[PDB]
Amino acid sequence: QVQSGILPEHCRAAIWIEANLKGDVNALREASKIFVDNVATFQAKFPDAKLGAVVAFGNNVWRQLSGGEGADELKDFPVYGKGLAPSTQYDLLIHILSARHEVNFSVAQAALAAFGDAIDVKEEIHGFRWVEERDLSGFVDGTENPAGEETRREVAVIKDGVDAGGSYVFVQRWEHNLKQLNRMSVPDQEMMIGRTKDANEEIDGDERPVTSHLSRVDLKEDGKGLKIVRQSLPYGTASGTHGLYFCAYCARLYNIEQQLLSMFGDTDGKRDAMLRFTKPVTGGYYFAPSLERIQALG
């Protein structure tokens, strides 16, 4: 029932394509069915790749496709922190992930053939897992991510009603300034993130700044954690732009928005300490319907 790209863990590479609709929204209906069948064919051909993919839609095209039914939290991505976090809301998101970049490339080609000239590709980012699953800053990324299919479903997959099997998606490309990061002492970097660098040990919440990344995004409501399923990867060239392509899935958009409001100063006027070396340059919210829902479009 769930689209194949949400639940796989420990992918080695991914491709994200963000696009606008140029043609009529009805063109996305046939295109989506073609592509999900393509993914099924690639999984059969490369079973070792552990390949998954997701097709998600922006608010305006999803309202049209759904006839206004369900996805009650969906909205265009707003700016956060009054512009600290920019907004680049598009109509279509394609997320391909697997153990093999060469398979992801063939699948991305299939996606483009399926949608054809109905879409205008605005962004295409090739993510790769770095050494020790670390972000390019040198800090491990993923330790507190939900682990196992059971918990990942609980966090990311809508449980019942019209949207059952669906998920909300958030994508945001960050540009790292490693020169600025490298100017910081390792203890200062550690207080910035909220975990030790080499050992990847949590720094006690009582002993780290409230502006530390963990203090900004490890949020609880009466003791219940606001969890998300992250699929982020490093990207770029060593000599050009590089950073983290941030990608999160959640059965509720609420959990993601609460973390953004926190990071960008809207909740308590304090900003994420990571903004001293990295900045977000894109931002979008998308709705990932279930496989049955996609089949039921056309």
- Which residues participate in the annotated binding site? 141-144, 213, 218, 222, 230, 246
Nearer to Mg ion, 145 or 232 (CB): 145
Answer yes or no whether residue 218 interacts with Mg ion by CB under 5 A. yes
112 binds its own copies (CB under 8 A): yes
- Interface with Mg ion includes 30 (CB under 5 A)? no
Rounded distance between C-alpha atoms, residue 189 and residue 112, angstroms = 41
Between CA 233 and CA 246 the distance in angstroms is: 7
Binding of residue 214 to ligand HEM (CB under 6 A): yes
HEC sequence for the chain:
CCCCCCCCCCCCEEEEEEEEECCCCHHHHHHHHHHHHHHHHHHHHCHHHCCEEEEEECHHHHHHHHCCCCCCCCCCCCCEHHHCECCCCCCEEEEEEECCHHHHHHHHHHHHHHHHHHEEEEEEEEEECCHHHECCCCCECCCCCCCCHHHHHHHHCCCCCCCCCCEEEEEEEEEECHHHHHCCCHHHHHHHHCECCCCCCECCCCCCCCCCHHHHHCCEECCEECCCEECCEEEECCCCCEEEEEEEEECCHHHHHHHHHHHECCCCCCECHHHHCEEECCCEEEEECCHHHHHCCC
From residue 1 to residue 30, the character string flagging contacts with its own copies as x (rule: CB under 8 A) and all else as - is -----------xx-x-x-------------
Identify what 142 binds: ligand HEM, Mg ion, its own copies, none; CB under 5 to 8 Å per kind. Answer: ligand HEM
Q: Rounded to 5 degrees, what are φ and ψ at 13?
A: -155, 155
d(Cα 55, Cα 286) in Å, to the nearest integer? 9
91 is catalytic: no
Site string for ligand HEM, 108-137 (x = CB under 6 A): ---------------------------x-x
- Whether 97 and 66 have beta carbons less than 8 Å apart is answered as no
Strand partners for 167: 288
Annotated binding site for heme b: 141-144, 213, 230, 246
Identified catalytic residue from 91, 135, 141, 163: 141
Question: In the complex with ligand HEM, which residue's Cβ is closer, 8 or 23?
Answer: 8
- Judged by CB under 8 A, does residue 184 bind its own copies? no
**Of these partners, ligand HEM, its own copies, Mg ion, none, which one is at the site of residue 106 (CB under 5 to 8 Å by kind)?**
its own copies
In this chain, which of 36, 121, 214, 297 binds its own copies, going by CB under 8 A?
121
Indicate the residue among 26 and 109 with the shorter CB distance to its own copies: 109
Residue 229-268 contact track with its own copies, rule CB under 8 A, x = bound: --------xxxx----------------------------
Nearer to ligand HEM, 169 or 228 (CB): 228
Instruction: Report the residue number, 53 or 155, with the smaller CB distance to Mg ion.
Output: 155
- Binding of its own copies by 131 (CB under 8 A): yes
Assess 133 for contact with Mg ion (CB under 5 A): no
Give the binding site for its own copies (CB under 8 A). 12-13, 15, 17, 101-103, 105-106, 108-109, 111-112, 121, 124, 126, 128-131, 237-240
| Residues belonging to the active site | 141
